[PDB]
Scaffold this active site. Structure first.
Site, PDB file in Angstrom:
ATOM      1  CG  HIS A 259      -0.472   0.361   2.601  1.00  0.00           C
ATOM      2  ND1 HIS A 259       0.027  -0.475   3.501  1.00  0.00           N
ATOM      3  CD2 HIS A 259      -0.489   1.622   3.187  1.00  0.00           C
ATOM      4  CE1 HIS A 259       0.304   0.196   4.599  1.00  0.00           C
ATOM      5  NE2 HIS A 259      -0.008   1.465   4.400  1.00  0.00           N
TER       6      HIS A 259
ATOM      7  CG  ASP B   7      -0.035  -3.885   2.862  1.00  0.00           C
ATOM      8  OD1 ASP B   7       0.403  -3.374   1.857  1.00  0.00           O
ATOM      9  OD2 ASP B   7      -0.265  -3.188   3.841  1.00  0.00           O
TER      10      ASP B   7
ATOM     11  CB  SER C 112       2.517   2.420   6.286  1.00  0.00           C
ATOM     12  OG  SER C 112       1.151   2.672   6.572  1.00  0.00           O
TER      13      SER C 112
END
Lengths: 230, 230, 230, 230
Positions: A45, A88, A180
């Site tokens: 992502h 992911d 992230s």
């Protein structure tokens, strides 16, 4: 990281900072982990619509590094699903960086560590994402990993799967936006067990579990796409 | 800003710094302009898929401000086209900020200024986007606004439209990634004429024009959505 | 610890907490380090007029442990000088405690680590001394060790000697009262390099260096009084 | 307190909790009594070599308080004898605290109460000293005050003097280490009659009397030093 502590340069020599430019011209920040002289592991992502990434290595100070290199290739998992965050993971190929006191790789699970679910273990997550503070200094905190069944109760049906590893944030200490792609590490074993993937829709101070990509579920993909057998 | 000058607090009291959280959880930086005590004008490409924004007002240091408020609402232009950047304008409603020495609004065009194309005037661009230095201080530069016909030649067909305004960067002074949403102002008249919208496909150091949303083309949309007359 | 972070149980398995009753009937708290199944190393100023010590092992929570034992013997360095803090080391003999996930010894310097002055290294100090917080949870922080010559400028003549090792507290992070006797550790090497000895007369938030007993200078004394060759 | 009852906030509004830093840098706990808005009465053996004290007022939880103030001055009795505990009384000047529901003063004897020996009355002792439980809540017990002649028999010659008052602990309810400086009060009359001074050489669970400073013997010293009449 919310309610985190400051690292010094050299505390987390495997931490990568990623300054990402997207296809739509925006500048995104994510973290990542140095897994090889030529490779960074991060979240899909972060980079699935990226054009280039500047990789910073070897400093706790954001946008500084003793090695600043540009990505040569970005490999996002082909089956990454934007809507559920399934799969992911992504690999960034970088020019060979020489390890140093400040720049060292994190170990990836091998052998029977591939069968360990790591429940009830305290692990360390680090990054330069939103914090309650001012700081430009790398932050970190500890989250206890919980079992997937307990974790699955906290999210809509279908989000928590076998390849997800969750960390508990009920003491108010949590990854937050910008963290992230960052490393979730068993410090004692210098082992990468998770990649920061998603925070609850309720936000970073909700007390909800944080979802991470479980690294044992992607060791074939990594092996295969890097061509390195760990 | 590539090859800009370093600003200091109070030099650009209308500049907003925007820390954006997207629906996909990534953390994005853009600039904006304070146009009223409760409104920021910025680019739709920055916030069209955003969920919340922290707004920094009144400091030249990135992620610092004498006022730090959270967005109450984000109105993105419904006809924005990602692929062409058509109608690249958005409004962030914020809690009423009081103007100080470091926080002041920028004038918007009105009356006959609405008919002016502003060709061949030097206007000032500012932002915290990619520069040649790793700096957290606001940068600025002067770029000459050129005519759309001249700009158009430098881009694909149909990218430069009536509502685009272009700034020449051939001295190598250019907005770059991260300056998105920032103000393009006639300093002497304290007038907002453009919002940074897109850099050339050739990048920032190519000598190619930068496109901006022509504010005079969106003054109706702005009064409709804010409910205020200018 | 001032401006420290919270440990969880198991982070510092070598940490001992000492509830000390003195000859004059007061209750003193100090820290210490588990160096052997039967031995704790701490500071002589903590225990030189003690009558008994209850040793807590295996928990980050103050006054809790998975092993709570009473001292069998206290050995304070015969040449400890109260006025200069010269020779501020002591050994507590305890009933054999079995190592555990939560209770593990710290390594002591051997070989040529005995000749290392450890300058410019970041080390970890931990304890339950005065903090800015409320907490009953073990805290820790990092202090960079500085060279003795730089350290000697900060104190009256004669305080900093060859057997002192100083840590820099100029970021405002410091041991404070109650942290005495606690471990100063090279985490990467799981090595005990110092025992918390003294804070500046200016106090814990002064930015002055903290003095510790340099463990390489007392390895003969330890060897000799424990009868263990490390 | 060994074998006491658990108090709660507001039960003992005159109880002070004292976190003492000694000249040798150790951290000591003692109790005290609020006797005026600017004064704590406690034992000289707690603070005679103290440099500063944090005073906790108004909470039964150790190191908690609705008022937390720092000592402005400490007056220890100049004739205190460490070896015999003669004249074991001290005053801590604090910044004026306002009495609330949880912070109230205890009455001191005056007039004819100055002549009362208080023999054979049940008085209440409270503190956070060693108990049979590891608890941070204030404990209390009732002890019968016995006559000095009876107490004296239980101690060395010359320890029990005119200015000592003793409480019987033969039901095994006793003050213990850490209760030092605490109040000994006639609850029904809200009267302070003693300050916990010393436990038997036999320890706390021996059934032996505890000595206290007889407050009626030091009411002159208290008015001289505080400047107030009672």
């Amino acid at each position: 990281i919310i309610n985190g502590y400051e690292a010094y340069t050299g505390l987390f020599p495997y931490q990568a900072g990623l300054d990402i430019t997207l296809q739509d011209q925006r500048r995104v920040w994510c973290g990542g982990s140095l897994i090889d002289n030529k490779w960074i592991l991060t979240a899909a992502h972060c980079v699935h619509d990226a054009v280039s990434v500047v990789v910073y290595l070897g400093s706790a100070v954001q946008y500084e590094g003793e090695a600043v290199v540009n990505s040569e290739r970005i490999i996002s998992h082909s089956m990454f699903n934007p809507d559920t965050y399934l799969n992911d993971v992504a690999l960034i190929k970088i020019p060979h960086v020489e390890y140093t006191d400040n720049i060292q790789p994190i170990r990836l699970p091998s052998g029977e560590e591939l069968n360990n679910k790591f429940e009830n273990i305290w692990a360390t997550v680090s990054g330069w994402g939103q914090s309650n503070t001012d700081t430009v200094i790398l932050q970190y905190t500890y989250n206890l990993v919980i079992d997937n069944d307990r974790c699955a109760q906290e999210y809509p049906p279908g989000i928590i799967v076998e390849s997800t590893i969750c960390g508990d944030t009920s003491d108010g200490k949590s990854p937050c936006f910008g963290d992230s792609g960052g490393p979730f590490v068993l410090s004692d074993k210098n082992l990468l067990i998770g990649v920061v993937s998603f925070v609850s829709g309720a936000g970073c101070e909700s007390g909800k579990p944080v979802g991470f990509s479980r690294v044992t579920s992607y060791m074939d993909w990594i092996q295969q796409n890097t061509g390195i057998k760990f």
